Amino acid sequence: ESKSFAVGMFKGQLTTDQVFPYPSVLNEEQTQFLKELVEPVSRFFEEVNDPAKNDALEMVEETTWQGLKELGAFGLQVPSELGGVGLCNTQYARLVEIVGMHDLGVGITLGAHQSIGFKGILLFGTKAQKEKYLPKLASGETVAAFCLTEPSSGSDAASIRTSAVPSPCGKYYTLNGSKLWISNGGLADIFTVFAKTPVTDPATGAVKEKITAFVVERGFGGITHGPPEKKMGIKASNTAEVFFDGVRVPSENVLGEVGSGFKVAMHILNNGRFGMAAALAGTMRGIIAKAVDHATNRTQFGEKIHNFGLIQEKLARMVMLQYVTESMAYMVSANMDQGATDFQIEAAISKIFGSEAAWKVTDECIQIMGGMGFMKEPGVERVLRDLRIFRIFEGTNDILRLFVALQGCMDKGKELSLSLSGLVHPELSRSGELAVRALEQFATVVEAKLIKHKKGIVNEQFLLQRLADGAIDLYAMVVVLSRASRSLSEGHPTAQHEKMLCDTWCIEAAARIREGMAALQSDPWQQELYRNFKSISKALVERGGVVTSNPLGF
Template identity: 60%
Template sequence: MLRFSTFLTKNHSCWVMMQKSGHGLSLRAYAASSAQPAPKSSTENARETKKEKKAFVTNSFVMNLFNGQLKSDQVFPFPEVLNQEQQETLQMLTDPTAKFFEEVNDPLKNDLIEKVEDNTMEGLREMGAFGMQVPQDLGGVGLNNTQYARLVEVVGKHDLGVGITLGAHQSIGFKGILLYGNEAQKKKYLPPLASGELIAAYCLTEPESGSDAASIKTRAVLSEDETHYILNGGKIWISNGGLAEIFTVFAKTPVKIPSGEVKEKITAFIVERGFGGVTNGPPEKKMGIKASNTAEVHFEDVKVPVENVLGEVGEGFKVAMNILNNGRFGMAAALSGTMRFAIEKATEHAVNRTQFGNKISTYGSIQEKLARMAMAHYITESMAYMVSGNMDRGFVDFQLEAAISKIYASEAAWFVVDEAIQILGGMGFMRDTGLERVLRDLRIFRIFEGANDILRLFVALTGLQYAGGHLKELQKAMKNPAANLGLILDEGAKRMKRVVGLNNGSFLTPYVHSDLAESASKVNKTIEQFGVSVENLLMKYGKNIVHEQFLLNRLANSAIDIYSMVTVLSRASRSLQQHLSSAEYEHNLTSVICSEGYERVQLNLNSLKTSEKLKNFEKMSKISQDLCKHGGLVQQHPLGF
């Protein structure tokens, strides 16, 4: 079995020498060898606190999109958060990680035996792969989000089953301890979790509570002596459920609100299997990600010490959602690796396969497939590193961008792998090629950590709520125009520009490379039209918009397309400005992405107001009701029996 070097050094030049000499560097060795930064002065801390407060009140690009505004600081320029030393170090971690997955891990065998092989698990522990974002002083590697994304991308390229095992452990399993744990909780739990000595799991989903997390039935009641909670309930489909020793569990607890009334609110707990009363069912039989352990977890009269409350009592829903929000960027990174693998398989086959006297790569049908696969990958990869980069820059409002990256990546990866199988033909259908396993593995990504259907509604409704608040502010100002003249005039000027078209192309001009001016102009038009559409929906439906899911889905799809276009415009502009060797290639990708994205946005936004489309939505609703009423298809069979 491959063993990575464990050279310990505090001199970065030694790392570079090791890389040049061909030696690898494990994640754990990196953590041990990283020099600790000097303590910050009180002035520096004060500046950082001020910066964090500023970031906290800064709404994200997509959030501002719902007001028809361009908030440029989170999209332009494309984030570059790693300094040269961090880049070189990351490269030295990336190479041995890739080598491990190529030489040690066997994804086909993992899929066949339906578990991650023991030698792979042990190798991952030795590498420090179970604690990539845990601070170094608590036994982890201490990577930032961008570094973590790159290594997750490597894992996603080789084995999504292993990726789920690692991700369920650290991306959500113990992420709550990182985000909300107090000092004592972190010191107690993070070191053994970071080493892989203990495995973690995230326990939210229940038989009657999937996307509707607030409807969970698991309960925890404070004991009479107030020293512990008694936890009872069950969770289903828990990744690492049969392996974990530490669980982040969400349960209803009685909470006294200021009025004196007692209400049931969700609270998050750190639960140890060793507390007793924690059991799990057998591994679930699944369509894909068979190597990852998925099981039911049951809690029967589990005594959870009060010091194991994670965050505040009654604040568990916020904890649950923020854990998911903070982990979603990793999914886009992992799936960009998966897509890279599929595209490499497809292109290799296309340039070597001869049919009808020519290489199939010369045929337009295959060329279109490959080009669309490349565009989908470019968008996914750009989103992953846009979101992770902004997180590393200190922005805290990225929930809509993270949700969009998850939606887009999971659907794009399915498309790319499916097309790769089509290009390979019968060979793609064969197990040994590896693509059929990947396709099975991919199907779950559109469901878990927020079903895409729900996330689309989340994007649309969250943005509409923000835009609605702005409209309320304006309506309030109109009641006292003399005192709010500046706000009213500013809003009036914006609307007038929309009407006469003076804004077309102007927003993006300072940020986008001149070669992409035509694409930028199209994107700017969609931003303007999107804002108008949002305003019209709010004026027409008000609070009842929540019931108009046909419209909400199309609004969300428009937001996804606009964010996709802006993200690639930003990245391609950087490539053109830096004269990268791939600049022309990226220019072509971006031009087509923006051209076709513009057309889709026009179609979706027009469907929000076109009478024929609205009638079609009503008819589809009736069709669905008829299906449900009859328990299936309604029409008579063409043969009459």
Template identity: 60%
Template sequence: MWKVAEKSYRLTARSLVSLSRSSLRNKSATVSAIEYEKKETTVPKAEANGSVESKSFVMNLFRGGLVPDQVLPYPKVITQEQAEFIQAMLDPMEKFMVEVNDAAKNDEIAKVEDHTMEGLKEMGAFGLQVPIELNGLGLSNTQYARLVEIVGRHDLGVGIALGAHQSIGFKGILLEGSKEQKTKYLPSLATGENIAAFCLTEPASGSDAASIQTKAVKSSCGNYYMLNGSKIWISNGGIAEIFTVFAKTPVTQPDGTTKEKISAFIVERAFGGVSSGPPENKMGIKASNTAEVYFEDVKVPVENLLGKEGEGFKIAMHILNNGRFGMAAALSGNMKAMIEKAADHAMNRVQFGSKIHTYGAIQEKFAKMSMLQYVTESMAFIVCANMDAGYKDFQLEAAISKVFASEAAWQVTDECIQILGGMGYMKDCGAERVLRDLRIFRIFEGTNDILRLFVALTGMQYTGKFLQPVSNAMKSPLTNIPTLASFFKTYASKRIGSKLGWDLGPSMSEHIHPDVSSSAKLASKAIMQFGLAAEDIAIKYGKKFIDMQFLQNRLANSAIDIFAMVAVISRASTSLNNNEENAKLETTLCNVWCNDAAKRVQENLTSLSDKTSLQDFKAMADLSNMVIEKQGVVQNHPLGF
């Protein structure tokens, strides 16, 4: 089987890679990621108070506004030539993942089989977004997302091996590297001759990346940095030759003092002093190599500084923000596979005289699984389209897509196993491997808990900038009566209107198809209520909100649901307007999802100010403290012994 498949896919792979690197070299269809960074975009306008107005939908959600630029109509920036090229790659990749890659074997031996790795290199899978002139395929973000859907559909372990290499491993070189750094490193990384890894996490710094202890000190001669430290849980850590490493460096401040700040470096294993621990024995994604990496007196040439000294934290966040959309795309593909596996079983399994797909309990599962996949897919391709369009402000949408996708995929796979019953629990079925693989997605590249806080705090910070004039006026109210009067007039009218049930939300009517108008009204109302809640929080708590994670979580959950609502409304509208096949089914997916999501938004926003909810938050904090103090459960056993 392997020999036949090998010949088939290799011929196709060679022709595609050749096509990409020659005849398409000068066509706009293969604009590289670097060229996208140079695209001109609309310059955000400055407000009277000096704040810059973002085009991000989620960011403006915190002001109760609808800025449609990035979401309505459903964005699609892929050209016909780009679409044709990526379509030509889908079948060979699908064939390869089915006939050549063996996900169960990879899981069993805890590595991607050698012939699979070689085959992926032949297909150009290690340099999907590297510019053509540097041995890559020059794919746009949208093309990349469409291809990794196929990989995620079949083997998340392989997906992580590829993603850790290019989505974060050498992404810093692609985004922030100098021309010389790109020319030196990207060609061998794009072909897979060298594997890359992203080294940020340390034993004492997980989510708190700013607390890393690895240090890099410039030599007295000024020609190199001496790097010392260690990193843990590094994907590709044991097989990588090139590392993007983050370390603290002494940086001279404008006043002449020295302060330790994080800087980023390109480190070669060949420099010496770089070593790796044994592969970690993990719960899932066993095919992906994960290891500790040690740096002992590594001499890193000054020309291998990535960006400027002290900019490492910003670079790390830029890399992670730019990579999250791929995770949502891969998990979208994974959910499709789980739905298909469950549907095949439900179609043939007979219980109590009927096939189980005829029972309402099973039908509800399939409906919810389908909606979760539809939302995830809709979010993923909104984010990558915005990136390809040249927008710079997409970090909240990318974070939400990662949170939603990782939790949705877990639910879908869990329900798949439930539908399969005992068969789903067995190893041969493959679903249990997928469930193990999925668990890490809620943890790495920003835990979902931290990303929720990131969404809430970033959005509230944006709101705070626009409320700053009012805050300043409050310090001297007698001399700022017009400013305060205008604000409180608007503030009062919005709340009175909300209490009376007036439809004060931003209208989507010009952007949407009539068949989803009921969902659009729910979304508009949710946007208005969200804006009011954010404004109330800013006024009531101010900077104290930074420490109020019970509220942050519920605000973030509301933002996630509202973005999901608008994503599916936008997509379904476009399908309806284009008379696409199954557009009516998309309408059903959209409307049922929005009906349910609107209820959750209402519940979460109510809890932000509801007296009973606030008391419960305090009670939960007290319970937690008691558990920590007792180092276990707090209650006595019901038997008394």
């Protein structure tokens, strides 16, 4: 039976192993080691890095780049014996939030390198491959890049065209194709490359085309890259086409099993996913400090503006968004450190929630600052620009919603083929009940929809996006119920404040789930909306844009 909360809640179960109590994973020594890293990393971003400069230059300033290499920043999760810092996921998250607070351009360059670029070697590498490649990865002597996307293939990884053909001797593969929008593409000397190869069935010998993952060195020859792409934000991060022209890849540079490269890609991306919400929790923390500072000190209509309800509500919503996001990020990383095998839905939720929360929080920080928020000098507009892509890469949020909904449905569909008392703190019992009723409402709809649509539920995308949103708010609720309950249990100095953040969040989340589930189940107009969305869009496509003229008709 799954220990995943998200897997259970689609089945109307309360599976709480990976949720309550809010996990603590670090031993005393890991805690002390992390403290002694947090200080120098924080000082480095404060004193050496200049985010506005990197953005202006469209690259990381060389002193900063070399300084990060010296700091160990290129190898945070590589074991010490292979020349890294040897951090676990939770320690990694703590340092990642520092980067996220200060410079997402730098963040993407370092995360492309290690969260995904050479991650597959950590996850699937043989001893030989790890010993060969990790030390120079960890020191940043060889930068890495994750090479999946192509001109034809973004969301649909299975459709990639880059190919790898085995030699007759079986000693190497010949690699041909191109990859698009590769972070560190123009900088990397090590590439994780996903290519279609012929795969022999063990029983019959029948040959089929499947993806295989490879570790590819720039020095193998036949590799070039395009010029850095110009883009809205994270402008300091290198983004480039990578070309593979008759590249000879040693057979021993297969990463994982021949033909299991799709699974390899998906595991790498799943594994790295929590890092995003971690970074963005930091982004939001920094941004909220700026918005609070503005509201504290700006007089308008005779008072400092923090005294006006519109501003108070904006600030309150921002911190709730930050708290939920940060709470998800550290829960998922703890689950991973504690040996969880089933956290993929929760990781997807955290990615969707965190990227959207950070976008909304930074958008409202601009609004609070007024005219000044739009100016370049305050640096907030630069962070908004950086943020836009986080909703699109590492799985578009639209595709991740489909994933959350369909993955959650899977086990309930297989089958078809409650109290938080004693877990939530007594001071949060009412919100705990809100969550349990929301779970019941959610599961009832899931069951009814699976019975109705069966396997054809996969094409019901209006419904699936709405189910995903229910799932997101349901996980958000129990994540903050857990964290605030532990705070209350421990008598932590912020516990009464966290209790308030939790109750405030839950009241509105429960309402979104109640009203959302009602729309799906009982609302006779819902099907008219769905029909009209399709007919309206069909009409736009026929026309190539807006169908109506303006009222004048020309």
